[PDB]
Design a binder for this molecule. Structure first.
Ligand SMILES: NC(=[NH2+])NCCC[C@H](N)C(=O)O
Ligand SMILES: [Cl-]
Ligand SMILES: [Cl-]
Ligand SMILES: [Cl-]
Ligand SMILES: [Cl-]
Lengths: 324, 336, 325
């Protein structure tokens, strides 16, 4: 079975087995690249990559995945896009859909990409919107499976620390619900995900055997976790509020799990080697913000495997929807 | 096969640089490449060729059409955007042309004066293709003529009658007039006299038309202009690199030439089709189109939503044909 | 004999024979492309081109060379958010190194590219930093060889006129010392290269048979030269008055006493009124052309477009040598 010709707009649109299939495909494509046996399933296909806001990481993952599979790409960056100011999205979708075989869109509201998905007539893939970051969560779930000693996703427990009211938190929560996982959102109540979405995901989790806990208590939130995940907190008010949710070595110890792994979608502020991270940390007497250098660079840290897996999972999305 | 040989290594700077039969050859070639692509039998004639795409203005259709065409034909591309170049600021176009010509096998240029692209064409040493200037947009019109043929069962171009409404002296108007003269068509340019093409260009086209059996009418009278037309064509009333303050004094002047359902009815032709080079301002789903239309109490500018989305509209077929026709130009001039 | 897996960060990192090898490979690749016999050694490789500062010239040479060799490229152009603002270079290098097979960097301090080179895990190539422009000098040396009536580099004498205190002057001086050449830096004393780099190059030149001369005297500086080289001079008002005596004009060519002397320039050049900037500057001083006159630039002595073409072939050599298989 396949997702041939589907769009990839948000994980809400997919079943448990369909998400698993994409992850399994990602693993097979990864192995094949490393083994030099990769079969080009997108040979002769042309893809357009529309970025209304810069996202070099997502961009590079799409380009490399396309190139590996025999496709060619057109990158349209923030200044290149005429959409919404000079040309409607409906018109733009119909035009691009005539010339290209598939289209990636990274932008603002989910409603924009849904309209592209409705009008383009070829597969449309969401590289990130305000609401959702579905490609990231695929990469994360693949990374979890690679680092969990054969535990399936439904047997995994993880915590996301800090500000969960944003695309990454939203997508982790949906993904966890879908896959029957036990997720804890650990952070200040004001920054828990949207109540409507939580309610929807709780409904999903009840059918899949998943669990969703929202808590301000770090000890309770991380106890027993296989993975700990965080992201940047964006600052005076936010830092003071978020500071207790910093992932440091003590937090790892509080899991009680010597095999705990640490994940971060990146970029991370973990030391004074960025302009911004130094500015903030100095103003606040910190060394690293959402995560400490010690944790970020430890053997528990799997962030660069997670980063690499952006590419393999985006490759799976394109192959599944557009490959032949 | 003189024709094919005679196209090799040419620049594609304006349709004034091509014969009737050459234009027909490129259109036919476009149709052949369109069929082959759909059939999955396309033979790559630009394998190993590298093409530079210089864009001094914004583009969606023309950029993507060059990229896709190049990719389909085995070529690779380097896109240099409006922030990327600055030509003439730090480096002369003569120098830039000579440098790019040593590295690349073909160059596309979209920008300002026709003189600039002609200088590029003179100095590069490889084929240079005009993807739009202030004065001309020749690839557009190849796509438009292919679309007209495809939507005129039986008819050749010399049998077709069409009207262009609006700003007749913009690049698209100019090119449509040239193209119609070259192909023996009956073209009406319908819009205010202040925006008619340059009298020297008109004279040149009228001379061409007399030998092909074409007809060129410039008129401010909508009914005389559209009566009997097979196709009605328009474009946005202010062009790129005109300043946005031009809208203020152009909308009211151009408003009588809006393509609405009533204009279609005035052709007297129930099978009239509508064309537009795109982008179009036909509703409130763009910030600029809403703001301008609202300033005049309009809904849609040069074309109404009703027309644009009707069964008479063939704009997305026209847009797709941008790629097949660009492909033809590159294959003819650089292919082997 | 190979450079497989090496970075190409600066000519200081290479031996005389390694530089010669790269130049010979550039020549071979050039001949192969013209002959239609090129063999693709980067087939299937993906390369990232990071340009923190624009250069359409260097960019196009990397792209075309990658394309000819079967590679695919991702061009990442200049923005408000530079490497090190939001993400460390160490993190960026590691991520890009997992996705790509090779990485070009053009940007700011040499330290940045050295860090990228240390962390990426794949070959890293310097397309220009504040300190060094190594790919340019390889192109220049190939061009010199091609236009030298049978002479090797060690046999060549050349002068660089004007402002030498910058990446091009620095690289030309290193390159010349490495290859045993006789280089004259001809210009006002305040614009000679960094004194520490001069000292280091004088030490290299002593091992290779090279010669480095710094002088303000044009006649003495250009006497006997096979090539004359310059670059743009733009504190715009004060520089131009200082630099004006070092304009390459026909009289300077004649002062070499060499009727076969050739003129080189890394480009872009201000040689007339057909650029906004060149016209704006020249007009203040009643000049037509700044560092070079139109007459010299467009003359039969000028080899600037051969030099420009050679940016591609030499960049191709660097990628093939380090990443090819
Ligand atoms: N991206 C665009 N606005 N394209 C329209 C191109 C044709 C139009 N007459 C122009 O020169 O502006
Ligand atoms: Cl990103
Ligand atoms: Cl999602
Ligand atoms: Cl034309
Ligand atoms: Cl160097």
């Amino acid at each position: 079975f396949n997702l041939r010709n589907r769009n990839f707009l948000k994980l809400l649109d997919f079943s448990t087995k369909e998400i698993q299939f994409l992850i399994d495909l990602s693993a097979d494509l990864k192995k094949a690249k490393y083994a030099g046996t990769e079969q080009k399933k997108l040979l002769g296909k042309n893809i357009a990559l529309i970025f209304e806001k810069a996202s070099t990481r997502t961009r590079c993952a799409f380009e490399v995945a396309a190139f590996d599979q025999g496709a060619q790409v057109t990158y349209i960056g923030p200044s290149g896009s005429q959409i919404g100011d000079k040309e409607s999205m409906k018109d733009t979708a119909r035009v691009l859909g005539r010339m290209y075989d598939g289209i990636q869109y990274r932008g603002f509201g989910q409603a924009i990409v849904e309209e592209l998905g409705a009008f383009a007539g070829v597969p449309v893939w969401n590289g990130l919107t305000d609401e959702f970051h579905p490609t990231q969560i695929l990469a994360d779930f693949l990374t979890m499976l690679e680092h969990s000693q054969g535990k399936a996703l439904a047997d995994i427990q993880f915590a996301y620390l800090g500000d969960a009211r944003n695309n990454v938190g939203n997508s982790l929560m949906v993904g966890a619900a879908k896959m029957g996982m036990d997720i804890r959102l650990v952070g200040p109540q004001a920054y828990w995900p949207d109540e409507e979405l939580v309610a929807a995901c709780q409904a999903i989790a009840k059918q899949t055997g998943g669990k969703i806990t929202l808590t301000e208590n770090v000890a309770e939130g991380v106890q027993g976790c296989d993975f700990l995940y965080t992201d940047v907190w964006v600052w005076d008010e936010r830092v003071a509020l978020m500071k207790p949710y910093q992932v440091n070595m003590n937090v790892l110890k509080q899991t009680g799990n010597p095999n705990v792994k640490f994940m971060h979608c990146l970029p991370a502020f973990h030391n004074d080697e960025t302009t911004i991270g130094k500015q903030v940390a100095d103003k606040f007497g910190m060394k690293g913000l959402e995560v400490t250098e010690e944790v970020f660079e430890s053997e528990h840290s799997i962030v660069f495997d997670e980063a690499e897996n952006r590419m393999h999972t985006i490759k799976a999305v394109m192959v599944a929807t557009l490959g032949s």
